Amino acid sequence: ELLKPRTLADLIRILHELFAGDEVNVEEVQAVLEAYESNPAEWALYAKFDQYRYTRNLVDQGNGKFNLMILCWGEGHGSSIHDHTDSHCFLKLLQGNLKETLFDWPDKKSNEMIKKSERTLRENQCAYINDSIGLHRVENVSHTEPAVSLHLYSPPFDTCHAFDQRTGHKNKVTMTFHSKFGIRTP
Ligand SMILES: N[C@@H](CSOO)C(=O)O
Ligand SMILES: [Fe+3]
């Protein structure tokens, strides 16, 4: 039975229930994430920005089944074209807007990676990606408004690949956390 999360804390409790087993009902997880109405007071602790690039701030470790984190995107900050290491990845906007550009997995032959589609993700909306859907880039294209998003990955992963848009060549990258549970983790 899926109920509306009343607060971020309630959302976390609900997620622990939805991930108690060995599989993931993607549509139910997406629905509960969408239903949580972003309340900035509840997540201010995690919203730690860096001047030069987007930051990843761990909120909950999901008793091992998932990581829930808040990403903070300065004006003009974006990601690489990347995969998600055989994990489910949910993205919900808490503040601002992000542009998501989708790409196909490259062929082994070196070639320009052409965009398959793009969309604008708006406040409170929840998107989903996995490697079977494709690769993506996420960017805050705003010149005036920082963006904040809530991300859930299951299983957790701390490495992925970044893809060179001009060739499709990939490189392994290790992901780091700017903070964990509200504490800066240099
Ligand atoms: N996967 C990127 C953010 S775009 O993914 O919903 C990251 O976790 O840093
Ligand atoms: Fe991503």
Curated annotation (Swiss-Prot):
Pathway: Organosulfur biosynthesis; taurine biosynthesis; hypotaurine from L-cysteine: step 1/2. One of its GO terms (molecular function) is ferrous iron binding. Keywords: Dioxygenase, Iron, Metal-binding, Oxidoreductase, Thioether bond. Its EC number is 1.13.11.20. The thioether cross-link between Cys-89 and Tyr-153 plays a structural role through stabilizing the Fe(2+) ion, and prevents the production of highly damaging free hydroxyl radicals by holding the oxygen radical via hydroxyl hydrogen. It catalyses: L-cysteine + O2 = 3-sulfino-L-alanine + H(+). Its cofactor is Fe cation; Ni(2+); Zn(2+). Binds 1 Fe cation per subunit. Ni(2+) and Zn(2+) can be used to a lesser extent. GO terms for biological process: cysteine metabolic process; L-cysteine catabolic process; L-cysteine metabolic process; lactation; response to amino acid; response to azide; response to cAMP; response to ethanol. Induction: By increase of sulfur amino acid intake. Fe cation binds at H82, H84, H136. Monomer. Catalyzes the oxidation of cysteine to cysteine sulfinic acid with addition of molecular dioxygen. Belongs to the cysteine dioxygenase family. PANTHER family: CYSTEINE DIOXYGENASE, CYSTEINE DIOXYGENASE TYPE 1. This is Cysteine dioxygenase type 1. It comes from Rattus norvegicus.
